[PDB]
Design an enzyme around this catalytic site. Structure first.
Site, short mmCIF file in Angstrom:
data_model
loop_
_atom_site.label_atom_id
_atom_site.label_comp_id
_atom_site.label_asym_id
_atom_site.label_seq_id
_atom_site.Cartn_x
_atom_site.Cartn_y
_atom_site.Cartn_z
N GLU A 52 0.82 -1.20 0.00
CA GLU A 52 0.00 0.00 0.00
C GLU A 52 0.86 1.26 0.00
O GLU A 52 1.89 1.32 0.68
CB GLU A 52 -0.95 -0.01 1.21
CG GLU A 52 -1.88 1.19 1.33
CD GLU A 52 -2.90 1.28 0.20
OE1 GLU A 52 -3.25 0.23 -0.38
OE2 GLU A 52 -3.35 2.40 -0.09
N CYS A 98 -9.86 2.78 -9.97
CA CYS A 98 -10.74 2.97 -11.12
C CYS A 98 -10.95 4.44 -11.45
O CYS A 98 -12.06 4.86 -11.80
CB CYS A 98 -12.08 2.27 -10.88
SG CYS A 98 -12.97 2.87 -9.42
N1 SAH Z 1 0.66 2.31 -7.38
C1 SAH Z 1 -0.05 1.87 -6.21
N2 SAH Z 1 0.34 0.80 -5.58
C2 SAH Z 1 -0.30 0.38 -4.49
N3 SAH Z 1 -1.34 1.06 -4.06
C3 SAH Z 1 -1.74 2.13 -4.69
C4 SAH Z 1 -1.11 2.56 -5.77
N4 SAH Z 1 -1.71 3.64 -6.19
C5 SAH Z 1 -2.71 3.88 -5.38
N5 SAH Z 1 -2.72 2.95 -4.46
C6 SAH Z 1 -3.62 2.82 -3.40
O1 SAH Z 1 -4.24 1.52 -3.42
C7 SAH Z 1 -5.66 1.65 -3.34
C8 SAH Z 1 -6.30 1.10 -4.63
S1 SAH Z 1 -8.01 1.72 -4.79
C9 SAH Z 1 -9.18 0.35 -4.47
C10 SAH Z 1 -8.82 -0.32 -3.12
C11 SAH Z 1 -9.50 -1.70 -2.95
N6 SAH Z 1 -10.74 -1.76 -3.75
C12 SAH Z 1 -9.81 -1.95 -1.47
O2 SAH Z 1 -10.11 -3.11 -1.07
O3 SAH Z 1 -9.77 -0.98 -0.63
C13 SAH Z 1 -6.02 3.13 -3.15
O4 SAH Z 1 -6.47 3.36 -1.80
C14 SAH Z 1 -4.70 3.91 -3.42
O5 SAH Z 1 -4.46 4.87 -2.39
#
Ligand code: SAH
EC number: 2.1.1.37
Length: 288
Positions: A52, A98
């Site tokens: 994360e 998304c």
């Molecule tokens: N390059 C990356 N690698 C890992 N996480 C990322 C990322 N870019 C954004 N994120 C984070 O990872 C999450 C993906 S968004 C959707 C999260 C997922 N549906 C859930 O179960 O919560 C977002 O909160 C964002 O802050």
DNA sequence: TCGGCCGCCCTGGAGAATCCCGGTGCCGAGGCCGCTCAATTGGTCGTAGACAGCTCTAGCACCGCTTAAACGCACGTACGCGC
């Protein structure tokens, strides 16, 4: 829609004498919904690795799981060496952001922008965590995304992951209106929504005291869906956690504002939908 | 679904101005003394005004018609007023 055709791989059930705890890789974790659902089902977790970026989500995980989560930074920093040195995985999960995959944007950038192409990062880690041929270890994977996608985008994702996306709507098991596509190879992937009596189906069971629900359920007019003391009031964050299936007062971990809690809870998974999905893993893995 | 700028509320600290407080000088107000001329007293008239009476003017009081104008009601649109 029958554009592609492939049988889902069904793994043989392992008996209790060769039963092992789960190793879980969670790529786009955010709010740690997966490990929350796994702890709620009473499943022994040997290793949970969440990659994360956002510090508020990392704070949610550190508060609600007490250092059990092994944190990685960005998913681009993960290589094949990091996958092969952290042991073989039993469950891989994730939902890509998304921002550009949703067709609710008029000026959307598509699958191949830095918000969408992170999915392919998932596929790369799907390619590294998958066991080679000859290994009969039960390996399971799960990808989540929104329903508001194009036909070509969903078709390319379904071809790349080689699975049939099941559509699950939160209104059949919780009090939210969101339909999500779920790619994966879990047993009972398209079995109907077994509604639990402990799950709050109606909206009013998720409200606090002194508040009356205007609608039957909430979405994801210049009014507000809850009356409070004969006055329209904004839907509360703890009530949003009760709608999304989270435990009461879950995403109150640091000194973040209301907008940050909205941004975290919006992107999060639905707990009952996951609980339904993770349910048959209980007979394939350890129990506590 | 996203964070990049943009107005709001609060609060904090520089910052110029002002109040307060002594310290020193300065010059005009308070006070004393001569004196001189007007305030005072006594006395004398002269007449302006207080007082009694008569008169006779108009000011108040009442009533009866008589319409002139005030009061009230609807209405509509033009100016007051806020933005
Ligand atoms: N390059 C990356 N690698 C890992 N996480 C990322 C990322 N870019 C954004 N994120 C984070 O990872 C999450 C993906 S968004 C959707 C999260 C997922 N549906 C859930 O179960 O919560 C977002 O909160 C964002 O802050």
């Amino acid at each position: 829609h029958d554009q592609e055709f492939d049988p889902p791989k069904v793994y043989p059930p392992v008996p209790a004498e060769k039963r092992k705890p789960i190793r879980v890789l969670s790529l786009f974790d955010g709010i740690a919904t997966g490990l929350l659902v796994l702890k709620d089902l009473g499943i022994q977790v040997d290793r949970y690795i969440a990659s994360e970026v956002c510090e508020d989500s990392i704070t949610v995980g550190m508060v609600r799981h007490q250092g059990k989560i092994m944190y990685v930074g960005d998913v681009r920093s993960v290589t094949q060496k990091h996958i092969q040195e952290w042991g073989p995985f039993d469950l891989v999960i994730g939902g890509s952001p998304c921002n550009d995959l949703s067709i609710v944007n008029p000026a959307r950038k598509g699958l191949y922008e830095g918000t969408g192409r992170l999915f392919f990062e998932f596929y790369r880690l799907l390619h590294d965590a998958r066991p080679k041929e000859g290994d009969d270890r039960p390996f399971f994977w799960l990808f989540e995304n929104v329903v508001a996608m194009g036909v070509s985008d969903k078709r390319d994702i379904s071809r790349f992951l080689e699975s049939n996306p099941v559509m699950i709507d939160a209104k059949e098991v919780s009090a939210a209106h969101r339909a999500r596509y779920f790619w994966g190879n879990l047993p009972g992937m398209n079995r109907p929504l077994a509604s639990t009596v402990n799950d709050k189906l109606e909206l009013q069971e998720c409200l606090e005291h002194g508040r009356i629900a205007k609608f039957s359920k909430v979405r994801t007019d210049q009014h507000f869906p809850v009356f409070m003391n004969e006055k329209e009031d904004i839907l509360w964050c703890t009530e949003m956690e009760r709608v999304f299936g989270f435990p009461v007062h879950y995403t109150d971990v640091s000194n973040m504002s209301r907008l940050a809690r909205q941004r975290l809870l919006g992107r999060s998974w639905s707990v009952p939908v996951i609980r339904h999905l993770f349910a048959p893993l209980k007979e394939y893995f350890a129990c506590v």
